[PDB]
């Protein structure tokens, strides 16, 4: 009872991030997203080459939508605020091509370097073995 295609994930880590956002050091996570579909990593204390090592599994339950990739600095007194990101078209893949490589980031904050983020992004079926 998988979807008819998956996107599989892999969010390894991130490279030379932006170490303060504003103020403080970031304290980043990374957001997914795929139409009304989030999902998220675990958050990495003040680390501007954080390294989340987390697997997920996304069905695309949505056709239209673009698959929207957010690097965020986690607050726990006020708001969480975007400070990385990259967006793909669905058809940017291939099913049963696992892509591996760096990806550079677009800084929400022009004028600022927002390093890079190395993913693994299997577009697969149902069936067919993650990765």
Known sequence: HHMT???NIKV????????????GKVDPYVQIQLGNEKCKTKVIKKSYNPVWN???????????????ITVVDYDFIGSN?????????????????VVDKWYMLNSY???RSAGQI???IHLATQNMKPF
């Open 109 to 111: 904050k022009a004028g």
């Open 81 to 97: 605020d975007a400070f990385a990101y990259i967006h793909f078209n669905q058809q940017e893949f291939n099913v049963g091509q």
């Open 12 to 23: 390894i880590e991130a490279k030379d991030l932006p170490k303060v956002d504003t103020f």
């Open 54 to 68: 987390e697997t997920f599994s996304i069905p695309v339950t949505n056709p239209k939508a673009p698959l929207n």
């Open 118 to 120: 190395h993913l693994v």
């Open 5 to 7: 295609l998956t996107f």
